[PDB]
C-alpha cells in the first residue's frame, strides 16, 4: 500500500509463460504488479548506495598568493630569472615592460619582467569514481495486505543476480535485476563540495578549467594550469602584478545546472536513476486463499477516496463471525447485471475481526456501484468518476511517450513479456537513440527546439523524405519540450 | 573625494530558521507569517499528499 498516493505510479498487467515479467524501477516512482490468481505487489526503489569511492581529481576553489617577487630585466639582455620558479608552487609569467635611464638601465627599450607568487589552495572539491561492482540497490517490497516495517527491504548487489525475499503468507518472491545496465558508473563521476554533492559526467568533470591534482597525490600542493585562477595585470606596461581570482564555488553551482543532487556527506547515497529488473513471481501465493468469505455485516470506517490515477481506496471493518475470512467485494453497473471494475488489491482478507482492512481498486468511468459484503447487509455507496476512455487512452500514451523519452531503449522493457515485437522495438529504438545521442550531445533544450523547427520546416516544403523529416522534427520537438534542460 | 553608495550587492549569503508548511490538495496553498517577512525568501511548490 506504500505505492498508493504516488503520482508517478504505473501498473503492469499479465505474466509470461514462465510467470515472469520485466519491470523497471525508478527513484521516486513505484510500480504496481498484478496478475491473474496472483498477489499484487508494490515495487519501489528507495536507496542507491556506493561503497569505497576512489578519489580521482581535486579542483581548487579558494586560493591565496604570497611571496610575490619581480626582477627588473633590461631589454636585449634576455628574460629575467628567479629562484622560486624552480618549484612549481610559484605561478610565473613573462611579460614585456619599459626600461630606461629613469629605470637605471644603459639603454632605452622594452625590458623583460617575471612575477612569481606561491600558490596555496584553501578550499577544494573532490571527484570520486566508484566501480560498478560496488553499487548497492535497496528495494522495498510491500503487498496489498490491507493493513493500516510492514514492507520487506531487500539488497541488490552485482555479486548476486538472484535475490530471494520471503513474504509472510505470500510465499517467496524471486527477484532478478541487472545493476550494471542502468546508470553507467565507470563512465560516471561523483563530485564533492563542502557539504553538497553532484552526480555528474566524468568527462565533463575532467574538462573543468580549474587547478587540479590527481587523486593519488598526498602533498596537495602541485596544482596544474594555475594560470586559470590567477591573473597578471600590466596597467601601463611598467610592471606586472599577480592577483588571485575569486571563489569559483558559486560559478561551479551555476555550472552544475543539469547535474543531479546526491548526498554523500555520510556514505555515498543516491536517489536517482533507473534499474531494469526481471520479476519472477513463480512461488507467490495469495495470502488467505484457503479461507471462506465473511458472511457477516461489514462497516466502513474511512470514507471512499480517489487517487490521481482514478483508482479508489476504502477502509472497512468487519463485525461478523468467521474471522479470518474474505471480504466479498466487486463492482456492478447501475443495472446490477454486469461487472465493470476489477480489483487491484486482489483477494482482500480480514485477519483480525477488530482490525480494519484497506480495500483499494479502480472503478469504471462514469457511475458505478461499490459492493461490500453479501445479502443481507451489502454496503451501497455507488460512485462518481470524472474522465473518459479516450482521455485515459491519450493520457496513457502521453505517459508512455514521456517514459520512453526519459529512459531510452530500456523503456521498451518496462512491461515487456519477451515478445518478438518487443525485441524489434528494443533494436530499432536503441539504434535510433544511438544516432540521436551522437547528434544531440551537449546542446540545451532551446537548441533541440530550434533544430526541430528547422527540420519540420524542411520537411513541410520537400515524398517519403518529407514525411520522415517532419516525423523526426516533431519527435525531437517533443524531446526538447519534455526535457528539463 | 565624495563617493555615494548606490546599492550593495550581496555575494555570500547564509540561511537559517528554515520553515515549512503543508496543505491538503484542493485547499489552496499554505501561508506563513514569514511569507510577508521579506527577509525570508519563500517559494510555493506542489507535493504528493
Amino acid at each position, epitope marked *: 500500500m506504500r505505492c498508493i498516493g504516488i503520482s508517478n505510479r504505473d501498473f503492469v498487467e499479465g505474466v509470461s509463460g514462465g510467470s515472469w515479467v520485466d519491470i523497471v524501477l525508478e527513484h521516486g516512482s513505484c510500480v504496481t504488479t498484478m496478475a491473474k490468481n496472483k498477489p499484487t505487489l508494490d515495487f519501489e526503489l*528507495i*536507496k542507491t548506495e556506493a561503497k569505497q569511492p576512489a578519489t580521482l581529481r581535486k579542483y581548487c576553489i579558494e586560493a591565496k598568493l604570497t611571496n610575490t617577487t619581480t626582477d627588473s630585466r633590461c631589454p636585449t639582455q634576455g628574460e629575467p630569472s628567479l629562484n622560486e620558479e624552480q618549484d612549481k608552487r610559484f605561478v610565473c609569467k613573462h611579460s614585456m615592460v619599459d626600461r630606461g635611464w629613469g629605470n637605471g638601465c644603459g639603454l632605452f627599450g622594452k625590458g623583460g619582467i617575471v612575477t612569481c607568487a606561491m600558490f596555496t589552495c584553501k578550499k577544494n572539491m573532490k571527484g570520486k569514481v566508484v566501480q560498478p561492482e560496488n553499487l548497492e540497490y535497496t528495494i522495498v517490497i510491500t503487498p496489498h495486505s490491507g493493513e*493500516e*516495517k510492514h514492507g520487506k527491504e531487500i539488497k541488490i548487489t552485482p555479486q548476486s543476480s538472484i535475490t530471494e525475499a520471503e513474504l509472510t503468507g505470500y510465499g517467496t518472491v524471486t527477484m532478478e535485476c541487472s545493476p550494471r545496465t542502468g546508470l553507467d558508473f565507470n563512465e560516471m563521476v561523483l563530485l564533492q563540495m563542502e557539504n553538497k554533492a553532484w552526480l555528474v559526467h566524468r568527462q565533463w568533470f575532467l574538462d573543468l578549467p580549474l587547478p587540479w591534482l590527481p587523486g593519488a597525490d598526498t602533498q596537495g600542493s602541485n596544482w596544474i594550469q594555475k594560470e586559470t585562477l590567477v591573473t597578471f595585470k600590466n596597467p601601463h606596461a611598467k610592471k606586472q602584478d599577480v592577483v588571485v581570482l575569486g571563489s569559483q564555488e558559486g560559478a561551479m553551482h551555476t555550472a552544475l545546472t543539469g547535474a543531479t543532487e546526491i548526498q554523500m556527506s555520510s556514505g555515498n547515497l543516491l536517489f536517482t536513476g533507473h534499474l531494469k529488473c526481471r520479476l519472477r513471481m513463480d512461488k507467490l501465493q495469495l495470502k488467505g486463499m484457503s479461507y471462506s468469505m465473511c458472511t457477516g455485516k461489514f462497516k466502513v*470506517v474511512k470514507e471512499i477516496a480517489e487517487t490521481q490515477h482514478g483508482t479508489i481506496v476504502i477502509r472497512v471493518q468487519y463485525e461478523g463471525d468467521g474471522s479470518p475470512c474474505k471480504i466479498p467485494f466487486e463492482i456492478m453497473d447501475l443495472e446490477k447485471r454486469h461487472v465493470l471494475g476489477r480489483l487491484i488489491t486482489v483477494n482482500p482478507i480480514v485477519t483480525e475481526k477488530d482490525s480494519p482492512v484497506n480495500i483499494e481498486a479502480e472503478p469504471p468511468f462514469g457511475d458505478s456501484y461499490i459492493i461490500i459484503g453479501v445479502e443481507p447487509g451489502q454496503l451501497k455507496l455507488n460512485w462518481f468518476k470524472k474522465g473518459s476512455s479516450i482521455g485515459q487512452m491519450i493520457e496513457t500514451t502521453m505517459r508512455g511517450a514521456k517514459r520512453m523519452a526519459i529512459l531510452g531503449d530500456t523503456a521498451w522493457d518496462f512491461g515487456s513479456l519477451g515478445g518478438v515485437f518487443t525485441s524489434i522495438g528494443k533494436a530499432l529504438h536503441q539504434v535510433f537513440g544511438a544516432i540521436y545521442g551522437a547528434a544531440f550531445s551537449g546542446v540545451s533544450w532551446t537548441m533541440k527546439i530550434l533544430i526541430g523547427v528547422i527540420i519540420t520546416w524542411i520537411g513541410m516544403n520537400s515524398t517519403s523524405l518529407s514525411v520522415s523529416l517532419v516525423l523526426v522534427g516533431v519527435v525531437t520537438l517533443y524531446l526538447g519540450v519534455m526535457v528539463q534542460a | 573625494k565624495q563617493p555615494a553608495t548606490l546599492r550593495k550587492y550581496c555575494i555570500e549569503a547564509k540561511l537559517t530558521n528554515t520553515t515549512t508548511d503543508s*496543505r*491538503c490538495p484542493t485547499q489552496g496553498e*499554505p501561508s506563513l507569517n514569514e511569507e510577508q517577512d521579506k527577509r525570508f525568501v519563500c517559494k510555493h511548490s506542489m507535493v504528493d499528499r
Partner: antibody, heavy 127, light 109 residues
C-alpha cells in the same frame, strides 16, 4: 524487545545546564528519529523537539530554540542533549520517544504509529 | 494548544466519550491524532493512533473518532485499571507537536 534507557536524575541550581541521555536498544537506532517530551509535576506534556539519527538534523520548539541543543552518537546508539538557562519551572520529568524515519533517512513526515515506545523517564530538579 | 476536559468520571462497565479540540492547523488539518495514558509515576504509552485504527497489543474497547476540529476518544466497558491520566496529541502543519491539558479518568466505586 524494544527498550529505552535514560540517565539518572540530576539536581542543579537554576540557570545552570543539565545534560541527560537516552539509549536505544532492541531496534535500529539509525533508522529512527528520537523525540523528547517533558512533563512538569502536575502539568501537561510538552514537545521539546526531535533529532534525526540518520543524518543529524535537529528541530527545537520555539520556547527552547536558544536553550536546547541535541547531539547524537551512532556508535553507542545514544542521543546526547543539554538544556541551559534553567528556571524554577524547568523542574520536570523528561521522556525520550522513538519514531521511524522515511526510506530516505529524513523526517519530513512522521509515520502514523509514531511515539510507539517511551523511555523510563529522567527527573531534573531545579533548586 | 489542545483543549480537553480536566477530569471525566463514569461508572465502571459503561461507555464514555472524551473530546479533544484544537485548531484547523493541527487537529482538523491532519489525521495525526494520538492518545496516551499517564500512569502515576510511569511513562506514557500509546493505545490509539490514527483514530480510525488501533495499535497492536491494545484492547479493542478503546475507539477513536474525529468530528471536524474536535477529536473524540470513546471507551466501552470501563474498568478499574482505566483510572489514569489521559492526553491527546496532534501534529501540526508547521512540523511541531502539541499536547492536551491532561485528563484524569475516575471510575466510580
Amino acid at each position: 524487545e524494544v527498550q529505552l534507557v535514560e540517565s539518572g536524575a540530576e539536581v542543579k541550581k537554576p540557570g545552570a545546564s543539565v545534560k541527560v541521555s537516552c539509549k536505544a536498544s532492541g531496534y535500529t537506532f539509525t533508522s529512527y528519529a528520537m523525540h523528547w517530551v517533558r512533563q512538569a509535576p502536575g502539568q501537561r506534556l510538552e514537545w521539546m523537539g526531535w533529532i534525526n539519527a540518520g543524518n543529524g538534523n535537529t528541530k527545537y520548539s520555539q520556547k527552547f530554540q536558544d536553550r536546547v541543543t541535541i547531539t547524537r552518537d551512532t556508535s553507542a546508539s545514544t542521543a546526547y542533549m543539554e538544556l541551559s538557562s534553567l528556571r524554577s519551572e524547568d523542574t520536570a520529568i523528561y521522556y525520550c520517544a522513538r519514531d521511524k524515519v522515511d526510506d530516505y533517512g529524513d523526517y519530513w513526515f512522521p509515520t502514523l504509529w509514531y511515539f510507539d515506545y517511551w523511555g523510563q523517564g529522567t527527573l531534573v530538579t531545579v533548586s | 494548544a489542545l483543549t480537553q476536559p480536566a477530569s471525566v468520571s463514569g461508572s465502571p462497565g459503561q461507555s464514555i466519550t472524551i473530546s479533544c479540540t484544537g485548531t484547523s492547523s493541527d487537529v482538523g488539518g491532519f489525521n495525526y491524532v494520538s492518545w496516551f495514558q499517564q500512569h502515576p509515576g510511569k511513562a506514557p504509552k500509546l493505545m490509539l493512533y490514527d483514530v480510525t485504527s488501533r495499535p497492536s497489543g491494545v484492547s479493542s474497547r478503546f475507539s477513536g473518532s474525529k468530528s471536524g476540529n474536535t477529536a473524540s476518544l470513546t471507551i466501552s466497558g470501563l474498568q478499574a485499571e482505566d483510572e489514569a491520566d489521559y492526553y491527546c496529541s496532534s501534529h501540526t502543519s508547521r512540523g511541531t507537536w502539541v499536547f492536551g491539558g491532561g485528563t484524569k479518568l475516575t471510575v466510580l466505586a
